Design a protein around this ligand. Structure first.
Ligand code: IHP
Ligand code: ZN
Ligand code: ZN
Lengths: 402, 140, 141, 290, 137, 54, 39, 211, 83
RNA sequence: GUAUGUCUAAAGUUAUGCUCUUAUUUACUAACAA
């Protein structure tokens, strides 16, 4: 079959179901024919019929199309199990039992059930064959197209409101600017970058702020609902769970940087007295310990190289498993390699960085999805990462030593 | 005698070997072509051809794989034909014939009287035939 | 829809019987003009007459042309529609045509419109018809 | 057939024990290629040739050309080659696999056509990938043994001989046009000698066609005979030509391989064929023996 | 380029198919409608142009420029009664827009049907319009 | 009169545009109310340290 | 290329369209009888 | 050769990046990176943030501003991003100032040509393909005309084949009027005008025929 | 300036362009044949064409006046710059 | 390799600064080989 042809020929669950029922019928009728055509004895017929009824599953993929027929099949199986073991008390094992009544009853009732269903189904089918399919298709909302529909409804509402507001009676092309503006605003909100376009009229800015708050509200609540759903362990779309992870991350970031803003806007949470007290405490502690502090690491160490080797090893541990690597990852690997090549030089570089570098490359993050609690994953830019490693290792060696 | 060219209605030209029946080169797509004629080019590198879009092209036929046009002969509203000897002379659909300097693509525009199938009397140096519609053959 | 319009059949066509018994299949065919379902009516003119007469066109179409639904002739004069339009064009005017759109979608659309065609406006109101007739007669002499 | 089936299943489960009863044609066993024994030799390299031409969309469009079924007999020098008319590709798609199938099909048909005496015993194949379907189409007759050559022989460049290519282009339909790949050589000397020369020639062609043709047409006074595929030379000038060709091959090796100077004898021989691979254990064997 | 009749017919068809197609997607792009109507005018088939205008009008009446364009198109071919009838219809539809009234007025003035311009002016003024209407009157 | 909305995200037509019109906000200035407390804090630390040190 | 919604599919056309006469799933008669109030 | 990205910002490269930013905006850093054969996405974005963005400033600090800076240092110890923000400057520059206070071309041209080519090419493959098909279609049409015209000249009249209609209700608009929505019924009489326009039409047709 | 004013002001203008230089009803048909001067309608037609032509050429001049990539963008940046 | 989309599949509708020669890059493409 050509792909087009193949597509055309995927006959639905009506036609196939019809075929299957006829297959069923064709079997038993054929068996009767055989019996009556002088081939097989009446006992053989009875057994044949029984076999057919108890193996409708195995003789005609009825279940394929309409799977609720498994119930019927199961019932038949049960009957067979019952019947046989009342039919084979003193009699041994073998195939020669007939007695097709109760199974036959089952199949009759299945047909009773389905006769309506097939009248509808095949009804519609042949109607389509004759009359074209209805060209007032209109699709319902479903989980799959809910969002798109929502958003279109929203932008229609917003657009309407703005037109109501706007006194000039502007053109649809001038509404494109409006709605596009809205879209940008939404994105800005998502980012947590304030959406302050200068040239607007205040009323419009108000209206859009409102509508994105509504949308935002819908979003956040939806996200929350999803996460409870995920916790429960319900049926949820892999894609949907990823979406929820994304949303919740953005939400988290927004929350976080809002907290930063808060911290800035009205001073640190720590009372200076409290801080002082803390300082006094810690000072007292080390005083009691005679704890000599960790120096800035010079060229003195016999351990320096050893220390370096640990950090590198640790870093390498990330990369030994995953053979396919990102660009950043590749860079990191290269750095590690070079460091092995040029240990002393690497050390020197590190030292220089420590002495000088107090502004670093920004840290990308993501959320690994433990389906209870999504965990933040900070990703430092490889060059600083080496420094961080070495410094860390050194600190631990010095701390534990001291 | 060996290599052989044949353009087509789909705007494609095909350099072939005499008998091989395997395209040495299909030409580019966004142009259009109608009349194929080789300029009596001293080196004999050149395969010229008229278009639908009022512009006769030139092609480096040696090698057959070469096909970069040097300079294009614009300004002859084409539904017709064109021929070379120095000069290329081709006629247009609407009005009249067009002599063109083969080196610079610009010369005199002689009146025809319509139709257009130009040719040169090759045994002489300067004599043309025009092919007008309905018994109007003009000679120069 | 509801069977609101009645069938528009002429006399000659239908035959000289005091009572015929015709049948109506509703939504019973696409018409011969506008490809559009309508109530197909049909009857044998006599009991033992072999030829059934079925209503070819739809009622809207019939009204539009102002014709019989079985004959395709004007309900007044029992003559070909084109011919009657020519006659009308000739007397009182220079141009009266009844252009059917030969494109399957547009024909439907045209049929839907409740608007008489060229000659149909004359032949609908009997006064105007009469006037046309007398003018025609005048033209003859 | 059943062995094929088991082997097929075995392949399906990636558990194929690489165990052959008959060893491959390596540079050592090259001698014992032929031994008063009716044979045939097959290459499927130039079955699916393509004109690369541009499209309206801008991407490449591959179109099939007429090809061949290089079907040689080293003893008689009778090169059969069924010229593949492009019509046979016009039927179907996925033509690289289909090339193999048509090849093996054609070969099988040919074998069927010939008598039980002239049904060739050991069939050698250039492309070891094309062996797999051949095995299938050789199931018609079980006596015809298959030989997967370890030594790659240049027969892609075989079709770049002038008259051959000419004939290929000429072909209008499903037809075969056999030739004697070497005629005068048979007349002068035994077949093996002829084959060595041929091998050299094809080798040179594979390295470079222009160089090859140049060597052949260095002298323009010499003329290629109407029947013969090659120019009929005198044996000393022939010798010279051969030497030149060899130099060409060595030159190529020097260029690409960058180690054509310090070659051992057997190794050198292998290099000429380009067949005895470094990883091939047969080579280790022969070497070990010496 | 556009030499013979049948060829011109084909051109007309193709162009229509383009225009029609673009209308199908955006029933409202009056720029597209009016452009199409201009095409009809250019073709010198007036009836089709009129039809286009009508359809366009139906699609969006409130777009005044469309009305104006239709009017002026009608004027172009000295089909003055059609212009007048249409303009009356425009007035009937959208009386409270002024430019339609003014368009009518100028048309009549150029026509030198001064009595009619008086009469219409009486009507317009009677509808308690803008002061502007009164002043112009 | 609404300004032609241009994004920092998504050009459909790929119109290049001025960099000022692209990137904006321009409101990092604040700096004043944020500091009220930090002075006290860092000063406190400095003084605390001094006290410890002496 | 791919564009926002502006002028909805207005059920004017769907009204003038011909009937289909298919039997959808939910238009099967569910809760035939109506309830009423005391009044 | 494939390799790990990095290096130094050549001025041409910087300019290219700026252009990209104008084009694609400040949040599609992948695309901009792609435009630069040497430099990464992250690198690019960082550069834009730090050096290249015009809504930064590199003007020297006033004495008051110096005071503000060093005071911030005193109070916020080496939290230089925060400090930078407070200043309203980029951070590296601020740090540098603080420190101060305390005391080949073929390749480049390749990427340029490619760059300019890209930036001046702002359509998805669907568009490009569509215009290609349009021009091809046009060409086909003219070729067809040339045949038809040729035959006419030759004396064989061939009617142009219709478009092979895609569906049963597909419309040819020259057959009959598209959807003749007639004018509003006539208050003022229109008969003479109808005649005149008809004549004009027929005359036009005649002219075309003669043309 | 509203479309109210711009109409009347354009009305006033074309009245200056004018200042440069019968009714018969069949009530049964409803057909109001206003037989008027055919020379004046022609003078309207030519004037109205000329007015539209003048405007048409006015854009053509203003289009041929001159941080962008294509025809549209240049104008789109011009739509931003006017603000 | 595909969805998919075009194409063909035969009967005649009655009118009178440049050209050139080459070698090299880079890019893209390629069910073509490795
Ligand atoms: O239990 P099921 O999966 O439905 O299979 C049963 C079952 O076979 P198993 O016990 O091997 O599964 C019966 O065996 P008993 O339990 O009765 O020993 C056997 O019945 P008979 O012994 O009477 O043959 C019958 O076989 P049959 O259908 O031939 O009656 C067979 O059903 P399947 O053959 O469909 O598995
Ligand atoms: Zn009748
Ligand atoms: Zn009808």
């Amino acid at each position: 079959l050509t792909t087009k042809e193949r597509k055309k020929s995927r006959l639905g669950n009506s036609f196939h179901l019809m075929r299957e029922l006829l297959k069923m019928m064709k079997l038993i009728v054929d068996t009767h024919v055989q019996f009556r055509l002088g081939n097989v004895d009446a006992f053989q017929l009875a057994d044949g019929i029984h076999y057919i009824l108890n193996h409708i599953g195995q003789l005609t993929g009825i279940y394929r199309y309409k799977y609720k027929v498994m119930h019927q099949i199961r019932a038949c199986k049960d009957l067979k199990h019952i019947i046989y073991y009342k039919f084979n008390k003193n009699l041994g094992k073998g195939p020669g039992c007939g007695f097709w009544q109760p199974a036959w009853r089952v199949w009759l009732n299945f047909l009773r059930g389905t006769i309506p269903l097939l009248e509808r189904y095949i009804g519609n089918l042949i109607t389509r064959q004759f009359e074209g399919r209805s060209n007032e298709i209109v699709k319902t909302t479903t989980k799959q197209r809910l969002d798109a529909y929502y958003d279109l409804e929203l932008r229609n509402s917003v657009m309407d409101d703005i037109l109501e507001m706007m006194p000039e009676s502007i053109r649809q092309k001038k509404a494109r600017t409006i709605l596009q503006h809205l879209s940008e605003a939404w994105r800005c909100w998502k980012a947590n970058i304030p959406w302050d376009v200068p040239g607007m009229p205040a009323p419009i800015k108000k209206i859009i702020e409102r509508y994105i708050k509504s949308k935002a509200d819908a979003w956040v609540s939806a996200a929350h609902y999803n996460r409870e759903r995920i916790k429960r362990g319900a049926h949820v779309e892999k894609t949907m769970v990823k979406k929820n992870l994304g949303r919740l991350t953005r939400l988290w970031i927004k929350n976080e940087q809002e907290r930063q803003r808060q911290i800035q806007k009205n001073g640190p949470e720590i009372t200076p007295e409290e801080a002082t007290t803390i300082f006094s405490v810690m000072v007292e502690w080390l005083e009691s310990r005679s704890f000599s502090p960790i120096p800035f690491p010079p060229l003195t160490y016999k351990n320096d190289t050893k220390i370096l080797v640990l950090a590198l090893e640790d870093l390498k541990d990330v990369y030994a498993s995953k053979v396919r690597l990102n660009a950043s990852e590749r860079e990191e690997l290269a750095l590690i390699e070079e460091a092995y090549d040029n240990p002393h030089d690497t050390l020197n570089r590190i030292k220089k960085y420590l002495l000088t570098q107090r502004v670093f490359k920004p840290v990308d993050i993501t959320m690994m999805e433990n389906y209870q609690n999504i965990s933040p994953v900070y990703s430092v830019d490889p060059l600083e990462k080496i420094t961080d490693a070495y410094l860390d290792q050194y600190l631990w060696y010095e701390a534990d030593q001291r | 005698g060996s290599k052989f060219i044949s353009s087509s209605e789909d705007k494609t030209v095909r350099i072939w070997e005499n008998q091989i029946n395997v395209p040495i080169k299909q030409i580019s797509d966004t142009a259009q072509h109608s009349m194929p004629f080789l300029n009596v080019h001293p080196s004999q590198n050149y395969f010229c051809a008229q278009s639908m879009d009022n512009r006769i092209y030139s092609f480096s036929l040696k090698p057959k794989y070469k096909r970069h046009p040097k300079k294009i002969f614009k300004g002859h509203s084409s539904a017709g034909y064109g021929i070379s000897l120095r000069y290329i002379c081709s006629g247009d659909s609407k009005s009249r014939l067009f002599t063109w300097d083969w080196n610079t693509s610009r010369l005199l525009n002689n009146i025809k009287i319509p139709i257009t199938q130009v040719d040169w009397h090759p045994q002489e140096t300067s004599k043309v035939i025009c092919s007008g519609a309905a018994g109007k053959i003009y000679v120069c | 829809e509801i069977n609101e319009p009645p069938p528009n059949i002429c006399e000659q066509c239908l035959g000289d019987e005091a009572n015929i018994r015709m049948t109506k299949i509703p939504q019973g065919s696409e018409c011969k003009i506008c490809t559009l379902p309508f109530t197909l009516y049909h009857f044998k003119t006599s009991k033992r007459s072999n030829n059934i007469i079925k209503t070819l066109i739809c009622v809207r179409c019939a009204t539009q042309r102002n014709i019989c639904q079985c004959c395709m002739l004007d309900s007044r004069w029992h003559i070909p529609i084109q011919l009657r339009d020519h006659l009308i064009s000739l007397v009182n005017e220079e141009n009266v045509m009844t252009e059917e759109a030969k494109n399957d979608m547009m024909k439907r659309f045209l049929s839907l419109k409740n608007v008489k065609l060229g000659g149909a406006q004359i032949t609908s109101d009997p006064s105007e018809a009469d006037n046309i007739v007398d003018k025609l007669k005048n033209i003859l002499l | 057939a059943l062995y094929v089936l088991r082997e097929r299943i075995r392949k399906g489960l990636q558990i194929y024990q690489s165990s052959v009863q008959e060893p491959f044609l390596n540079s050592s066993n090259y001698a014992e290629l032929f031994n008063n024994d009716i044979k045939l030799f097959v290459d499927d390299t130039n079955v699916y040739r393509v004109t690369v031409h541009k499209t309206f969309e801008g991407n490449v469009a591959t179109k099939a050309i007429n090809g061949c079924i290089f079907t040689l007999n080293p003893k008689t020098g009778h090169l059969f080659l069924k010229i593949i008319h492009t019509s046979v590709w016009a039927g179907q798609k996925r033509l690289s696999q289909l090339a193999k199938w048509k090849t093996a099909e054609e070969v099988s048909a040919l074998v069927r056509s010939l008598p039980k005496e002239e049904q060739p015993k050991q069939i050698i194949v250039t492309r070891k990938a094309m062996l797999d379907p051949l095995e299938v189409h050789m199931l018609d007759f079980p006596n015809i043994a298959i030989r997967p050559t370890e030594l790659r022989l240049p027969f892609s460049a075989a079709m770049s001989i002038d008259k051959l290519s000419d004939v290929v282009m000429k072909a209008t339909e499903p037809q075969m046009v056999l030739f004697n790949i070497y005629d005068d050589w048979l007349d002068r000397i035994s077949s093996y000698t002829a084959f060595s020369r041929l091998t050299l020639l094809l080798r040179a062609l594979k390295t470079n066609e222009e160089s090859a043709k140049m060597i052949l047409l260095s002298d323009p006074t010499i003329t290629i005979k109407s029947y013969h595929l090659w120019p009929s030379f005198t044996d000393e000038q022939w010798i010279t030509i051969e030497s030149q060709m060899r130099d060409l091959i060595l030159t190529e090796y020097g260029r690409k391989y960058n180690v054509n100077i310090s070659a051992l004898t057997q190794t050198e021989i292998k290099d000429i064929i380009l067949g005895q691979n470094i990883k091939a254990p047969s080579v280790k064997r022969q070497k070990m023996a010496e | 380029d556009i030499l013979d009749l049948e060829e011109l017919r084909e051109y007309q068809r193709r162009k229509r198919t383009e225009y029609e197609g673009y209308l199908k997607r955006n029933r409202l792009d009056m720029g597209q409608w009016i452009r199409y109507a201009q095409f009809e005018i250019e073709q010198h088939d007036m009836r089709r142009a009129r039809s286009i205008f009508e359809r366009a009008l139906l699609v969006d009446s409130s777009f005044i420029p469309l009305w104006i364009r239709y009017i002026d198109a009608e004027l172009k071919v000295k089909c003055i009664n059609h212009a007048r009838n249409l303009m009356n219809r425009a007035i009937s539809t959208l009386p409270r827009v002024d430019k339609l009234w003014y368009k009518y007025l100028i048309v009549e003035e150029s026509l030198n049907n001064v009595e009619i311009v008086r009469s219409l002016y009486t009507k317009w003024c009677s509808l308690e319009p803008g002061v502007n209407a009164w002043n112009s009157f | 009169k609404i300004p032609a909305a241009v994004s920092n995200w998504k050009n459909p037509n790929g119109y290049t545009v001025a960099l000022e019109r692209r990137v904006g906000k321009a409101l990092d200035n604040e700096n004043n109310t944020i500091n009220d407390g930090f002075m006290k804090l860092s000063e406190a630390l400095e003084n605390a340290d001094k006290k410890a040190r002496q | 290329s791919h564009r926002p919604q502006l002028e909805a599919r207005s059920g004017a056309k769907a009204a003038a369209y011909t009937p289909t006469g298919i039997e959808h799933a939910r238009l099967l008669p569910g809760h035939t009888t109506l309830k009423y109030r005391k009044f | 050769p494939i390799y790990v990205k990095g290096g130094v910002w050549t001025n041409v490269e910087d300019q290219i990046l700026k252009a990209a930013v104008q084009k694609y905006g400040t949040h599609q850093w992948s695309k901009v990176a792609s435009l630069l054969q040497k430099k990464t996405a992250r690198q690019s974005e960082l550069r834009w943030n730090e050096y290249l963005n015009p809504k930064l400033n590199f003007t020297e600090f006033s004495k008051e501003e110096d005071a503000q800076l060093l005071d911030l240092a005193r109070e916020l110890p080496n939290q230089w991003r925060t400090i930078a923000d407070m200043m309203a400057r980029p951070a590296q520059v601020c740090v540098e100032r603080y420190n101060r206070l305390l005391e080949l071309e073929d390749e480049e041209k390749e990427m340029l040509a490619e760059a300019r080519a890209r930036l001046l090419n702002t359509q998805g493959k669907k568009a490009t393909r569509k215009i290609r098909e349009r021009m091809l279609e046009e060409s086909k049409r003219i070729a067809e005309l040339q045949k038809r015209r040729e035959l006419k000249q030759a004396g064989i009249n061939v009617a142009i084949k219709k478009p092979k209609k895609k569906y049963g209700t597909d419309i040819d608009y020259n057959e009959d009027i598209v959807y003749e929505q007639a004018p509003m019924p006539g208050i003022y009489d229109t008969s003479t005008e109808d005649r005149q326009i008809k004549k004009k039409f027929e005359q036009f047709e005649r002219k075309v025929n003669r043309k | 300036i509203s479309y109210d004013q711009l109409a009347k002001l354009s009305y006033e203008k074309t009245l200056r362009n004018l200042a440069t230089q019968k009714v018969q009803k069949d009530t049964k048909t409803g057909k109001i044949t206003i037989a008027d001067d055919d020379k004046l309608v022609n003078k309207l037609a030519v004037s109205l064409q000329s007015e539209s032509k003048k405007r048409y050429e006015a854009r053509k001049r203003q289009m041929q006046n001159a941080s962008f990539i294509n025809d549209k963008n240049k104008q789109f940046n011009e739509k931003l710059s006017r603000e």
